[PDB]
Amino acid sequence: REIGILTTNKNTSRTHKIIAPANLERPVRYIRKPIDYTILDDIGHGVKV
Amino acid sequence: QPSQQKLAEKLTILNDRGVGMLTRLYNIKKACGDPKAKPSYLIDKNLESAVKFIVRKFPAVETRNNNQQLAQLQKEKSEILKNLALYYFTFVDVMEF
């Protein structure tokens, strides 16, 4: 009791070196599309045609 | 009409398209450079004559009188059109860009 006056909790925890994510990122198929110039019309004060 | 030009959208989209084309061409070059990941058709021996003849005259295509030189290519065209589609389509996209 008399020595406990000068004691504080050390912060100690153990993890696993490498922790994997709940779900792994999957590859996405590449789909060819034409050059579209009407994709920013909804950003700011856009013009149509 | 400057309003209808939309130069900003054109530039900001073409920059991204060019970056993507650069990445795709770099990947294609790296794949085709090392002699381990390039298509087997470019390293295969029996198919060497056809590729050499085609390279000899690239701009012009003449399959009418082949003189029994593209016979090997004539029995595997389905695989050539299934394996080399990506590179040709990337070249077409580069031309369009």
Curated annotation (Swiss-Prot), chain B:
Part of the WAVE complex that regulates lamellipodia formation. The WAVE complex regulates actin filament reorganization via its interaction with the Arp2/3 complex. Actin remodeling activity is regulated by RAC1. As component of the WAVE1 complex, required for BDNF-NTRK2 endocytic trafficking and signaling from early endosomes. Expressed in all tissues examined except peripheral blood leukocytes, with highest expression in brain, heart, and skeletal muscle. Expressed in cells of various brain regions including Purkinje cells and dentate nucleus of the cerebellum, CA4 region and dentate gyrus of the hippocampus, and in frontal gray and white matter. It is found in: Cell membrane; Cell projection, Lamellipodium membrane. This is Nck-associated protein 1. Component of the WAVE1 complex composed of ABI2, CYFIP1 or CYFIP2, BRK1, NCKAP1 and WASF1/WAVE1. Within the complex, a heterodimer containing NCKAP1 and CYFIP1 interacts with a heterotrimer formed by WAVE1, ABI2 and BRK1. Component of the WAVE2 complex composed of ABI1, CYFIP1/SRA1, NCKAP1/NAP1 and WASF2/WAVE2. CYFIP2 binds to activated RAC1 which causes the complex to dissociate, releasing activated WASF1. The complex can also be activated by NCK1. Associates preferentially with the first SH3 domain of NCK. Interacts with NYAP1, NYAP2 and MYO16. Interacts with TMEM132D. It comes from the Eukaryota. The gene is NCKAP1. Belongs to the HEM-1/HEM-2 family. The chain holds residues 7 to 103 of 1128 of the full protein.
